[PDB]
């Protein structure tokens, strides 16, 4: 009689739950579909005068600018799943 049991399987193939703390939840994420992101910062500041009534204002300094290049590299994995498995494996391996 023990052949008539058919143990029930899980709903979804679970997995070890490794850390997802990634610094991505606090950093500045910018979606760009290019080869580099060129963020522009102002490494300095302006100038002010407290002018008089008859001061005949002169030039005030202007912030100088710095450009940082984000080269936007890529990250690739290529897991080789068998074809006999993908169709015989009622779980969804493609989305897993």
């Amino acid at each position: 009689g023990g052949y008539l049991v058919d143990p029930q399987t899980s709903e979804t193939i679970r997995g070890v739950l490794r850390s997802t703390a990634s610094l991505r939840q606090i950093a500045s994420v910018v979606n760009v579909e290019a080869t580099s992101f060129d963020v522009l910062v102002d490494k300095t500041d302006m100038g002010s005068g407290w002018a008089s009534e008859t001061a005949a204002l002169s030039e005030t300094a202007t912030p100088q600018i710095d450009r940082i290049t984000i080269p936007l590299h890529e990250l690739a994995a290529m897991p080789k799943a068998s074809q006999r498995l993908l169709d015989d494996s009622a779980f969804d391996i493609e989305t897993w």
Partner: peptide, 9 residues
Amino acid sequence: ALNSAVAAE
């Protein structure tokens, strides 16, 4: 925002 000639400024 000064001249467009030098990179920094």
